[PDB]
Amino acid sequence: ETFSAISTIGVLVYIVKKYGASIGAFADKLNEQKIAQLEEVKQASIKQIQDA
Amino acid sequence: DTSTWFITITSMIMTLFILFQLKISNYSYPASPESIELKTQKHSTPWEMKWTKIYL
Amino acid sequence: MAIHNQKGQTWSLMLMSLIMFIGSTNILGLLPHSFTPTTQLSMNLGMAIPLWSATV
Amino acid sequence: QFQFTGIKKYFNSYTLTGRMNCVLATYGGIALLVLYFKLRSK
Amino acid sequence: AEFLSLSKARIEAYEKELEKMKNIIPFDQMTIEDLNEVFPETKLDKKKY
Amino acid sequence: ASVVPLKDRRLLEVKLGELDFTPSGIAGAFQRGYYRYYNKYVNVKKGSVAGLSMVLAAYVVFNYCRSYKELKHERLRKYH
Numbered sequence A: 001e002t003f004s005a006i007s008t009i010g011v012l013v014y015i016v017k018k019y020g021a022s023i024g025a026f027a028d029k030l031n032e033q034k035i036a037q038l039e040e041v042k043q044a045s046i047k048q049i050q051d052a
Numbered sequence B: 001d002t003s004t005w006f007i008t009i010t011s012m013i014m015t016l017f018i019l020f021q022l023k024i025s026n027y028s029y030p031a032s033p034e035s036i037e038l039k040t041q042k043h044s045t046p047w048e049m050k051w052t053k054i055y056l
Numbered sequence C: 001m002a003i004h005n006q007k008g009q010t011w012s013l014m015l016m017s018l019i020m021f022i023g024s025t026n027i028l029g030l031l032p033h034s035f036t037p038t039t040q041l042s043m044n045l046g047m048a049i050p051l052w053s054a055t056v
Numbered sequence D: 001q002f003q004f005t006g007i008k009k010y011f012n013s014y015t016l017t018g019r020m021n022c023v024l025a026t027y028g029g030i031a032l033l034v035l036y037f038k039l040r041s042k
Numbered sequence E: 001a002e003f004l005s006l007s008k009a010r011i012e013a014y015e016k017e018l019e020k021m022k023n024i025i026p027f028d029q030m031t032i033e034d035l036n037e038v039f040p041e042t043k044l045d046k047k048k049y
Numbered sequence F: 001a002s003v004v005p006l007k008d009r010r011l012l013e014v015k016l017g018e019l020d021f022t023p024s025g026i027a028g029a030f031q032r033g034y035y036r037y038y039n040k041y042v043n044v045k046k047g048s049v050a051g052l053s054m055v056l057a058a059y060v061v062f063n064y065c066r067s068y069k070e071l072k073h074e075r076l077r078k079y080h
Helices: A004-028 A031-049 B016-023 B041-055 C018-024 D008-018 D022-040 E003-019 F003-016 F030-036 F055-069
Strands: none
Touching: A004 A031, A031 B041, A031 E003, B016 C018, B041 E003
16 A cells, blocks of 8 residues: 555655756855855955055 | 553653754854954954054 | 844754754655654653743 | 763753753653553553 | 054054955865854854844 | 764765865766656756655665565465
8 A cells, every 4th residue: 555655756756846946046045145255355355455 | 553651762852852952053144144244344443543543 | 033032042042953853753754664753642742841841 | 972062051051941851751750650550450 | 753653553454454364265165264263253142133 | 883884974975965075066976866767856956856865765665674574465476
């Protein structure tokens, strides 16, 4: 009695469809965070070198 | 089924909450990082006034 | 985090470990022949009472 | 082991109220006894 | 004499402040501790949000 | 035997999906992991299916062994 073996493996195939959009989200995730780190390395140099 | 007698699993659940407090404790947080964003500016800002009083 | 907003925010770093364990151990068992520990009533009476009486 | 000093600052903070498994332990011991009692009288 | 040298140390400390900022990252995927100089960390219960 | 099973997960994890060693997982061995199903689980690029769906395929066939004694059902022959 495991024809419900396929249907719990069939539904996990439909999520591979949206997983190709999860990649974009994954790629997008931390882009802000890495950029979130690019703002501090850019602000600290330019605010000081003119002050000197 | 209606199982019985209970001497099992519950001693093997609190060993698990030594694992999950080990992994999740090392989590980078965007908010925490944000809170380290202004700590570098205003020390150098009054340091500009440290030479403004050292001259004037 | 948003509701509490106190110095009871120290407790909240544990409550996200509690959501990943029974978030996972309820999602693993949908597989063909796997076994869920939150099926048995034993450990859930050890998840309620050491947490509920930690509040009063 | 070093599964302690990473989280040792956390423990004596909240195990003052969180490490009260005595109630849990007491309940467990009683539960084992009743099951044995009913199987003793079958 | 003093104001050209008190600005010179303020030029010298600002010349050291940027060169330490080049020390922190050798690559985008560089390090989890070398990025822990500029962006801060603290003791228990500092970051409220 | 502890350094034997610990060097199974560490070696396998790096090889299967992601870690000059971090970008080695950026291309990934997912192209190596791909060919087993047919083609269809293609979304493994940044949400990696073949990295995860091998452990869960191992945990099923490991639990098929314990159940085998109970649900015998087999005649003096082979299947349909």
